[PDB]
């Protein structure tokens, strides 16, 4: 097993460019987070580059996409963004930016040609990982994960990632989901269902994905009252299914019981014996399952993520 770091070429991610004069004010009144964006050139050019987590969210204050933005170097009057959304709703964005975008001097448009990698250490002690990205050059757009470290690096590229990352091979995208379930990190449409995941129980603030200190945005009174409310009551957890599971795997939304019966969630998303559960944040401990079709049980258990605060 002689390769570093695994590639993976993430299909159900895409890019959408956001350019013009009035790009910030008109984003940033749409996200739960402030822009990224680098310090400017100095003394050179050297290639400066950031990424940052955010969430769009609709009037109720729900999730409906969940974003990675980068910083696009324009050196003039426009500012210039590359947002990374699921490849399923990306139509749905542009309507959703479209409705904002009238007397704003800002264009959008798709980026299909820059497809989305993640690059993650084949093994956690990542010697090495310090300097991967002066290790990868300036012909890799290698940016680490803004969610957590956990999550290894974003390349985007036209390329093949191996070709660009000394040390790495193809890897098999169950992998990286799986990866994902393991360490709780929540991704897509299945994980935050648009206009049903809430975004502080989906931990968007162990993500860096929300400012409590920007301006007005879409779904900001929610989300300030639930954050100055008190902690939060449930959240995702990942969990991991004990025994050989059902065919159909676990349907979304199947409940969560404790050995007493009593509800503390309900199950979201996974792939194979892994996966993600809404849980009240209490009570994750106790031995848990969900109920089969006979009612026979299956058993599961919810862990805290070591990256989360």
């Not at 159900?12 to 910030?24: K, N, S």
């Not at 019981?257 to 969630?265: D, K, M, P």
């Amino acid at each position: 097993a002689g390769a570093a770091w695994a590639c993976f070429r993430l299909d159900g991610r895409t890019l959408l460019r956001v350019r013009g004069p009035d790009a910030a004010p008109f984003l940033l009144g749409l996200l739960t987070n402030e822009l990224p964006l680098p310090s400017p050139a100095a003394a050179g050019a050297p290639p400066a580059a950031r990424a940052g987590y955010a969430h769009f969210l609709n009037v109720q204050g729900r999730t409906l996409y969940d974003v990675i933005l980068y910083g696009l170097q324009e050196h003039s009057e426009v500012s210039g963004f590359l947002l990374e959304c699921d490849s399923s709703v990306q139509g749905a964005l542009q309507k959703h930016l479209a409705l904002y975008r009238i007397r704003r001097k800002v264009t959008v448009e798709p980026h299909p040609e820059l497809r989305v990698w993640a690059v993650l250490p084949s093994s956690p002690e990542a010697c090495g990982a310090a300097s991967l990205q002066e290790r990868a050059g300036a012909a890799a757009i290698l940016i680490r994960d803004p969610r957590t470290a956990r999550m290894g690096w974003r390349l985007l590229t036209q390329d093949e990632g191996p070709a660009l990352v000394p040390g790495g091979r193809l890897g098999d995208l169950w992998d990286y989901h799986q990866h994902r379930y393991l360490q709780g990190v929540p991704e897509g449409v299945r994980d935050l269902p648009p206009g049903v995941a809430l975004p502080l129980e989906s931990n968007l603030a162990f993500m860096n994905g929300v400012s409590f200190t920007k301006g007005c945005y879409i779904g900001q009174e929610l989300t300030a009252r639930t954050h100055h409310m008190g902690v939060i009551r449930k959240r995702l957890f990942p969990v991991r299914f004990l025994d050989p599971l059902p065919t159909s795997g676990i349907t979304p939304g199947a409940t969560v019981l404790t050995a007493s019966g009593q509800t503390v969630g309900k199950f979201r998303a996974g792939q194979g014996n892994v996966g993600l559960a809404l849980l009240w944040s209490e009570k994750i401990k106790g031995p848990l399952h969900i109920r089969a079709s006979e009612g026979a049980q299956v058993a599961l258990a919810a862990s805290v993520p070591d990256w989360w605060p």
